């Protein structure tokens, strides 16, 4: 997965 940080 990519940068999934909100």
């Amino acid at each position, epitope marked *: *997965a*990519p*940068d*999934t*940080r*909100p």
Partner: single-chain antibody, 226 residues
Framework: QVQLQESGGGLVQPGGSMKLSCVASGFTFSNYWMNWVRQSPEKGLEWVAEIRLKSNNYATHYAESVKGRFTISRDDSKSSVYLQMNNLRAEDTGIYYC????????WGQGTTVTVSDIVVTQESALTTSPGETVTLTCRSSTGAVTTSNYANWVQEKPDHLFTGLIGGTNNRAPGVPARFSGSLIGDKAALTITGAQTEDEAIYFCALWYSNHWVFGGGTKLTVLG
């Protein structure tokens, strides 16, 4: 107000080298991956490189078009990301943007560089009018788009002004109007404007994630008539 500001572009000859810089403010820079994306003279967006966090040993990935020639780096103490470009080619000509956050929420103004196989498909153009519902779509040549492609939607307004609207398929970026929503519909990613407004006349790009790189679609020119 998050701000990204690129610098270092110019007018160079083939074979040369150039280093771009981007300084970030208004968010916790060190907690997010950063990317470079470029826009060529034929108006298309192309993802160039990403850099991950200190906790990922600053891992990097590149588009095959620049692998071995470009180097992405970052300095968290200066809130800055860099792109070293070697062996420049005419095809590297474009506007270079630094961008990141969920996953392309924030974009700088861009710095111009003039040097002198998955396909993502979007509708070339759609026409709507104020108050209508319009849905833009984003198809992958690999097969069905799923949540594992982490679809993003980005808006280009005049003068090369990019704003991320949606990331992770359906997560609206902070401050983005509620009329914008992301979905998956019939094996494609989709952006819906529920009640289009005159100011929504713009070019809309989707980007899809494939394990370790992004592919941007060709963009949809949305006209809002009346």
């Amino acid at each position: 107000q998050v701000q990204l500001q690129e610098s270092g572009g110019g007018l160079v000859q083939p074979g040369g080298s150039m280093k771009l810089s981007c300084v970030a403010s208004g968010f916790t820079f060190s907690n997010y991956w950063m990317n470079w994306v470029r826009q060529s003279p034929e108006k298309g967006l192309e993802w160039v490189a990403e850099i991950r966090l200190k906790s990922n040993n600053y891992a990097t990935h590149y588009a095959e078009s620049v692998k071995g020639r470009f180097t992405i780096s970052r300095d968290d103490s200066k809130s800055s990301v860099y792109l070293q470009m070697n062996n420049l080619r005419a095809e590297d000509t474009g506007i270079y943007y630094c961008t990141g956050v969920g996953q392309f929420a924030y974009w700088g103004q861009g710095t111009t560089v003039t040097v002198s196989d998955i396909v993502v498909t979007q509708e070339s153009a759609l026409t709507t009018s104020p108050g209508e519902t319009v849905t833009l779509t984003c198809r992958s040549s690999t097969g069905a788009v799923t949540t594992s492609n982490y679809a993003n939607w980005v808006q280009e307004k005049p003068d090369h002004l990019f704003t991320g609207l949606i990331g992770g398929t359906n997560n609206r970026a902070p401050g983005v109007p509620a009329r914008f929503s992301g979905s998956l519909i019939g094996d494609k990613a989709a952006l819906t404007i529920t009640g289009a407004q005159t100011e929504d006349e713009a070019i809309y790009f989707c980007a899809l994630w494939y394990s370790n790189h992004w592919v941007f679609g060709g963009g949809t020119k949305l006209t809002v008539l009346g």
